[PDB]
């Protein structure tokens, strides 16, 4: 049973870390998009200008 | 009767020793397998990685 538990536990610690790197990925993507939106905000600013 | 008893006794002392060496055999086998399990634990660690 314990061998199955250690299987589960340390496997899920790695999977936690894979998830955390994923969180960071989506974070960087989000930043890029925020700034795409600043541009597009400017594009309406310029279209109206 | 005693000759049969000495037959039994010293024969069974040898058989005891054969059994003890067997205990050691299965012990060494067990150690090898323990460490196979450490590897396989790592293999799930790496598959999840």
Swiss-Prot record, chains A, B:
It is found in: Secreted; Bacterial flagellum. Phosphorylated on tyrosine residue(s). Belongs to the bacterial flagellin family. Flagellin is the subunit protein which polymerizes to form the filaments of bacterial flagella. This is B-type flagellin. It comes from Pseudomonas aeruginosa (strain ATCC 15692 / DSM 22644 / CIP 104116 / JCM 14847 / LMG 12228 / 1C / PRS 101 / PAO1).
């Amino acid at each position: 049973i314990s061998n199955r538990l250690s299987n589960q536990i340390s496997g899920l610690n790695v999977a936690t870390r894979n998830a955390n790197d994923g969180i960071s990925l989506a974070q960087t993507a989000e930043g890029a998009l925020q700034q795409s939106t600043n541009i597009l905000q400017r594009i309406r600013d310029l279209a109206l200008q």
